[PDB]
Amino acid sequence: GPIPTAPRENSLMFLSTLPDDTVPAYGNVRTPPVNYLPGEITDLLQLARIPTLMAFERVPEPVPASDTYVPYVAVPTQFDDRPLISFPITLSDPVYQNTLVGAISSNFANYRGCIQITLTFCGPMMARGKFLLSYSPPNGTQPQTLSEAMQCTYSIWDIGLNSSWTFVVPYISPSDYRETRAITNSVYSADGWFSLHKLTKITLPPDCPQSPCILFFASAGEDYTLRLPVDCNPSYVF
Amino acid sequence: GPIPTAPRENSLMFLSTLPDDTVPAYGNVRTPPVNYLPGEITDLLQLARIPTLMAFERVPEPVPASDTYVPYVAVPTQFDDRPLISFPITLSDPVYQNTLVGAISSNFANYRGCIQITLTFCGPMMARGKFLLSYSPPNGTQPQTLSEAMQCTYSIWDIGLNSSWTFVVPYISPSDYRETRAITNSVYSADGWFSLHKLTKITLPPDCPQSPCILFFASAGEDYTLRLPVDCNPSYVF
Amino acid sequence: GPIPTAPRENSLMFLSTLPDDTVPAYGNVRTPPVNYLPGEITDLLQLARIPTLMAFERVPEPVPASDTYVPYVAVPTQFDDRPLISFPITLSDPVYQNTLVGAISSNFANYRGCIQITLTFCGPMMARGKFLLSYSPPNGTQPQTLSEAMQCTYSIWDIGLNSSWTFVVPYISPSDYRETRAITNSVYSADGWFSLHKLTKITLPPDCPQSPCILFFASAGEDYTLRLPVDCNPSYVF
Amino acid sequence: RGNNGNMTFNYYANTYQNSVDFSTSILNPLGYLK
Amino acid sequence: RGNNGNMTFNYYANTYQNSVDFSTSILNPLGYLK
Amino acid sequence: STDNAETGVIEAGNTDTDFSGELAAPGSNHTNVKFLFDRSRLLNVIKVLEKDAVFPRPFPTQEGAQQDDGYFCLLTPRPTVASRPATRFGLYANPSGSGVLANTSLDFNFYSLACFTYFRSDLEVTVVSLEPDLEFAVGWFPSGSEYQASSFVYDQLHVPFHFTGRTPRAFASKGGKVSFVLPWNSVSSVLPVRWGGASKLSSATRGLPAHADWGTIYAFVPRPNEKKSTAVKHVAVYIRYKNARAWCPSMLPFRSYK
Helix, strand or coil: CEEEEEECCCCCCEEECCCCCCCCHHHHHHHHCCCCCCCCCCCCHHHHHHCCCCCEEEECCCCCCCCCCCCCCCCCCCCCCCCEEEEEECCCCCCCCHHHHCCCCCCEEEEEECEEEEEECCCCCEEEEEEEEEEEECCCCCCCHHHHHHHEEEECCCCCCEEEECEEEECCCCCCEEEECCCCCCCCCCCCCCEEEEEEEEECCCCCCCEEEEEEECCCCCCEEEEECCCHHHHEEE | EEEEEECCCCCCCCCCCCCCCCCCCCCCECCCCCCCCCCCCCCCCHHCCCEEEECCCCCCCCCCCCCCEEECCCCCCCCCCCCEEEEEECCCCCCCCCCCHHCCCCCEEEEEEEEEEEEEECCCCCCCCEEEEECCCCCCCCCCCHHHHHCEEEEEECCCCEEECCCEEEEEECCCCEECCCHHHHHHHCCCEEEEEEEEEEEECCCCCCCCCEEEEEEEECCEEEEECCCCCHCCCC | CCCEECCCCCCCCCCCCCCCCCCCCCCCCCCCCCCCCCCCCCCCHHHHCCCCCCCCCCCCCCCCCCCCEEECCCCCCCCCCCHHHCCCCCCCCCCCCCCCCCCCCCCCEEEEEEEEECCCCCCCCCCCEEEEEEEECCCCCCCCCHHHHCCEEEEEEECCCCCCEEEECCCCCCCCCEEEECCCCCCCCCCCCCEEEEEEECCCCCCCCCCCCCEEEEEEECCCEEEEEEECCHHHHH | CCCCCCCCCCCHHHHCCCCEEECCCCCCCCCCCC | CCCCCCCCCCCCHHHHCEEEECCCCCCCCCCCCC | CCCHHCCCCCCCCHHHHHHCCCCCCCCCCEEEEEHCCCCCCCEEEEEEEECCCCCCCCCCCCCCCCCCCCCCCCCCCCCCCCCHHHHCCCCCCCCCCCCCCCEEEHHHHCCCCCCCCCEEEEEEEEEEEECCCCCCEEEECCCCCCCCCCEEEEECCCEEEECCCCCEEEECCCCCCEEEEEEECCCCEEEEECCCCCCCCCCCCCCCCCCCEEEEEEEECCCCCCCCCCCCEEEEEECCCEEEEEEECCCCCCCCCC
């Protein structure tokens, strides 16, 4: 006689995430070889720690050309005591539109860990300035002038023979994992703004042009781990 | 060929108490750690042997304030030969409304074992009295005066430098388990009344106030074990 | 992939005699102990070999009291040459209405083996008689007078200081098992009549009463085995 | 015994199958005449 | 423990059954009076 | 005896504390908290989606809004209004008038045992249709995330996106029932049954732990949008807790008098 069985409530259903495999309808086939072409991917995080150029809203001179959005900073000559660039950390903000960690975070739900941003100078070698960059966890208002960005967490930076300064936003948190986008902009999903100030004036000889430029990158650090995917945003196709 | 099988009468049903688990629809995830915060619960009986203040009907002076119900005893000065507090043992009576063993018994069906009640004096140190507390298994009528409560099972009690007297109602029974509430108030569900009498008068010097007070607790002893849950009473939500 | 299976014709049915068990809907419970009370039953045959008083139709003097049926024998003084009690062996006859082996046979279908009947005298000690008891397998007619019951299988019996005589009807049979009731009164279900005769007169002194009495018992022997139950007769409840 | 075919195995452990008792710490006849 | 009859085997490995933790690298009472 | 209870800690006392007699055997162990909760329990019922869904708004909402309410079920034991985490629990006793009645929920019998302050488990989702001869489909997305709602046409038929995606789906049989267990996914550490706190740093309602939850289940039929019936239908949802833990005990709901 057959072995007695009892079918449980889960009959004939198929789960999308169901960790099992199905009988093939045609098998015992071979394939072309693989090994000749290099460059495998085991984890996309080997992918995720590549530099990526951020994207910002253009200063109030809208050029009527297509998509007036700018991957650099135009430092002004004039003395004012407000920062150059200030942007939050919510990984769906319109400053994080096409950064890699923003991009492959945009279809996942939760991450943990640090976020490197670095910045590459571009200007004439006879020009030189001092720039500090500063970060503050969420206060009530936003820290605006130099005392507020002074007390918190910063690094000053020279212009010399090199051209960059690797910076890493530290990872302070109530809970170990954090979200990727804020349905309600709470303390669990934002972590305070980031800014950089000019500390002393850009200094440069005569007959060389004004207003230098600085590019921004954004990359995953070491501890940056992802989890638990979600369905995607098809809005790129429309 | 496949292994022959025979489905039995139990097809596709799901039992609520059914001791088995189901295939997950999404797995291989991690979690935040646990170990930092102390105070685990393995059994609720570690919970159940905490003191809890009982609740009684107020003596005939209804104060119009909300819920005139009283967690103490107002001993009178006058000589009368009826007890101070007399209450049964049925774990749904309006004296057992918010005691712990009453509370986590109110959703279970059967228990076994002892029931500690203790009582904490509160009065001026220059006052002193002698109080006995007595317990009787179910007689025909209720034992009322001091000979009846005298013969059965009691303890007298002093007032001194301490302030309490741990008492344990013994566990005499026809059957080893007992019920928790009486749908028909039978011998299996009640166990006779409990009372305490004043034996000699409270004695106290001049210019210190009359009528002292005594608080009552109620806790599970050692052998107090529970079994076999039941659906709850949602009447707290209305 | 799952293991391939093939459900046979027996799907979702439940057999009444089906030797298997079912998943519990609530488990891991305890119970009161057992061991204190004695008198177990492993087999009902330990039950079945207890004496039991038979029941007969009353001799033609119907007392109008309820159920004029008699568990003894009224021996007459008069000389006639027909037996005292003659009854067949079919275990549903109105002489086997409330004997034990009749009673727990009345819901089974087939037995095998012997059937003890014994008889207990009751009379004055100064009275004494000689009684033989006789058994014959199925002849054409019924053996009536003393030559016929003489040739077959018998035992004579004294009256002395004891009061009984254990008799065992032997077990002669075509087939080893036999039925319990006869839907058609065939050779497989009956085994000939049983009778007892008075051999010499009851002898007794003056001024002591006439017509003594004898009780009948009926019990299973050693080899009496039962098999294969059947649905019962609910006619006791109407 | 009873009537079973379960000479190989049962699925659940026996403490889930049927209740067992507490801890208080060739057949026989039914009562002799001493 | 809980309530199971799974004294033989489970189908999936336990890392697919329920989440396990990270790496930060006879019963007891509930708080003494020292 | 003769100890005093004012030290805060008293032990238990058997019969031989002051009387003559010996202590009784332990009966059972239906007490351990990772066995007590493991019971299949429904929390509520659900109106079934059949179209491009839209989900309700933040906290104030003026009239003229277009959302489809009572189609989601933010499955927690915590009190919930309109499928978003509230802090109190309603019971609409006099429902006559205009303005739509919100979808309330709470896990009734969980609190009547609950003497805890923090909780930890995994759960399972059991669904059952109440209307006869029905076939449906259940969907899910994790906590700290949000439902995707649009439609893309295929061969003149408008078909929404929640047929597909990353997060798992499940298609039932002919009047069958779907069940699967579901693990932790929360950003915080342990589930609170009490909370202080607020959602953001300032100007927030004090008390609702918005991201210490589980997720939500929605039901929908496998049909294109333009072939939708006029009769609405219903379906219930069931939860059984698993592998639970507990910490730092507390009180019980207050019983009536009344």
